[PDB]
Design goal:
Chain B: This is Cyclin-dependent kinase 9. The structure holds two protein chains of two kinds. By secondary structure, chain A is mainly α. Chain A folds into two domains: 142 residues, Cyclin A, domain 1; 110 residues, Cyclin-like (Cyclin A, domain 1, Orthogonal Bundle), CATH 1.10.472.10. Chain A is built from 14 helices and no strands. Chain B folds into two domains: 93 residues, Phosphorylase Kinase, domain 1, CATH 3.30.200.20; 220 residues, Transferase(Phosphotransferase) domain 1 (Transferase(Phosphotransferase), domain 1). Chain B contains ten helices and ten strands. In chain B, the strands form three sheets. Chain B has a five-stranded antiparallel β-sheet with strand order 1-2-3-5-4, covered by helices on one side. The longest helix of chain B has 20 residues. Chain B starts with 12 loop residues before the first strand and ends in a 16-residue tail after the last helix. Classes of the chains: A mainly alpha, B alpha+beta. The interface between A and B is medium-sized, with 26 and 20 residues.
Chain lengths: 252, 313
Amino acid sequence: NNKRWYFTREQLENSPSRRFGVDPDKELSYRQQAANLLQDMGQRLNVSQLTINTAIVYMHRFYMIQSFTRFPGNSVAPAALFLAAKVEGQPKKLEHVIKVAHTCLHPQESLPDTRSEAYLQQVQDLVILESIILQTLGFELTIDHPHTHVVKCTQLVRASKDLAQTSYFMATNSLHLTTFSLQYTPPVVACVCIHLACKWSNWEIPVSTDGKHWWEYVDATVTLELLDELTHELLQILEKTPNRLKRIWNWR
Amino acid sequence: SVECPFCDEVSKYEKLAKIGQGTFGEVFKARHRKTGQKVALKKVLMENEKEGFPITALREIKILQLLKHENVVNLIEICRTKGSIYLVFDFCEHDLAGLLSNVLVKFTLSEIKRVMQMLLNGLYYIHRNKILHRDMKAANVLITRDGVLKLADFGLARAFSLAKNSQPNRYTNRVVTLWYRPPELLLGERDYGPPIDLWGAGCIMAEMWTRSPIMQGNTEQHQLALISQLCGSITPEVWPNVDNYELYEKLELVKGQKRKVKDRLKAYVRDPYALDLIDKLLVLDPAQRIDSDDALNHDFFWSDPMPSDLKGM
Ligand SMILES: CNc1nc(C)c(-c2nc(Nc3cccc(N4CCCNCC4)c3)ncc2C#N)s1
């Protein structure tokens, strides 16, 4: 139903992985790395950032049910991306996804003879995994992403091409870096991204003439207390991430 | 074996009887083992399917999940097997193709009105939600034991979108059963929309009296011939710019024909309003063809005898 894929913090501590002894910190990486592998493959497969984001959410959700100890991220990412491309209508071929995943995971290694038994096996493994993903997610594949909501909001507040692009950037990075997707509705995450991008640009959105703050035009539930708590959490991890901030840093 | 909270084994249902031997995939009537709830099972076919789970099935599932309406069949859940996959639907007692092909079964004008009303209402809903059904036919219309009509079989359905930028949509031309297929498609259109479903609505409406598909072509050319013998012949006068399919010439369509829609059906139908509505559904130019909204407003639904419930039968 509606609260099915949103979890309390307390629920996030008791994840399938913990259960099997994976520290919270360790688990987080595992996620960030899967998101990285997705981003890398997706770019070479030439699929949209939207499709990559979809596979990332699939991955996030998958691991609220399954454990990294049983299903390693290097196995799941390709299957997830394979699925997300089919769903987002940018289908990429099974053999092609296999190839690209191989070079990413094993840059030096040499692709197996497609005639081989070893290769036929990995083809079959991807298909099996896609099916385990479909079933774990219970066939719920339509994903709402913050980005839809970002665009709408950043137009309504007449942000510069720059501010808007920075907010879209925050959105994409929230998926790679955080479990916000498992906790907050996309529209709320969109507000968090726009807020942070403002802070980072020194931009301030003028309080409407009604005395209503912008986010109130966006989500009823949202409060500034929540926004500051969240932008802080997001900014912290951006700071840990080598070179990420450099990308939005005003070098002048 | 592995954690699977949200995908139940289909064994929770007990198979009663096949009910779809030759219509697409195998379809079963079944019974929930605890509650007795009757449902329909459809297995997802895997005939290579060398590309994992069929992209076609993903599309249908996505669409079934989106569409929630009294006149649209309801996907309850998807079940695994322990390997296959099944779409589980609420069961519907009747099928309009069946009821119509049954000499015992009889409709009053009042009920026929009601049927058309529900059908048109279902179309209005799916279109409003940017979905084209693409397989309008009697056999894909169901009716529940309580007389509620449901649009079924979204296996060829597809989302659509508007314009844009003067770049035409390039949707698939190979859509819709031949007998129910609109002129546009037969003339090679790939930038079509909701009007194709309404053409089908027309064919079905007429079928409510004739008890048989009005235009049973054998090939596209035969179909186009039949359509011309009924709706007049395809003329840039009748259908502005029709002349610009690279298939206008190749078709070499008949050109003496004049519109006989109301004359040829005059016999069976009788009711003036019914004939008028059918005439406005079976219009050649998709752009002059009535839409579900206007159709629902048509005097056919607002004159005596007013539309009534499906009692008995
Ligand atoms: C057209 N393909 C279909 N798939 C499903 C799952 C269908 C369906 N069918 C019923 N009940 C029902 C009752 C009487 C007859 C039939 N069939 C036989 C005659 C022609 N072929 C198809 C219809 C089916 N209830 C719910 C669903 C659903 N979804 S029909």
